[PDB]
């Protein structure tokens, strides 16, 4: 158990399924079988194997009084850069692959993510208890919800149904509008 500092590279692991927050260059299909239209953006998935594509760099917001080599505190605003593809995690009001009521999770290019879409790239390590606000984020021993600031959803995954072949049968990740739910619980598994 060690402190997570800004600009550390981390892996983020789901408590109920053991899946890691993962990404790769593959994109969502333009249309799902039920006819809904996705954003055709980059996929974000839950992956049960340790891997380089599970790595995310924790970054401060644009004009922040936090810097590198300083601890991340619970409920502070952060951004997550996927290391392997150099893209920013983002959520938005687009129906997810398997849950029409939950939000699609994607990544965007640095240019898009630092421009008009920037507000949608902000997240928080939300404490399970609001009273733990301001406590230091640590690996392994601190549970949190990965909370999207702009739409107030919590990143969620499941393993009862897996993605189709375009997603390598990895787990769907989506934004759950019911924030307080143990299935929204994640931990930082390792600091790279």
């Amino acid at each position: 158990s060690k402190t997570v500092n800004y600009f550390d590279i981390i892996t983020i692991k789901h408590q109920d399924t053991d899946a890691f927050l993962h990404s790769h260059l593959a994109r969502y299909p333009q249309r799902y079988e039920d006819g809904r239209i996705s954003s055709a953006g980059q996929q974000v998935t839950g992956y049960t194997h340790p891997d380089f594509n599970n790595q995310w760099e924790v970054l401060p917001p644009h004009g922040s009084d936090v810097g590198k080599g300083q601890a991340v505190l619970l409920n502070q605003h952060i951004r997550l850069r996927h290391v392997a593809t150099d893209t920013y995690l983002l959520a938005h009001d687009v129906a997810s692959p398997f849950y029409p009521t939950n939000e699609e999770i994607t990544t965007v290019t640095l240019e898009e993510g630092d421009g008009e879409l920037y507000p949608e790239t902000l997240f928080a390590f939300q404490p399970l208890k609001k009273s733990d606000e301001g406590h230091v984020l640590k690996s392994k021993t601190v549970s949190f919800r990965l909370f999207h600031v702009d739409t107030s959803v919590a990143l969620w995954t499941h393993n009862d149904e897996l993605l189709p072949d375009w997603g390598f049968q990895q787990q769907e990740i989506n934004g759950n509008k019911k924030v307080i739910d143990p299935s929204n619980n994640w931990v930082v598994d390792e600091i790279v």
Partner: peptide, 4 residues
């Protein structure tokens, strides 16, 4: 496109 399709909203949640």
């Amino acid at each position: 496109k399709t909203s949640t």
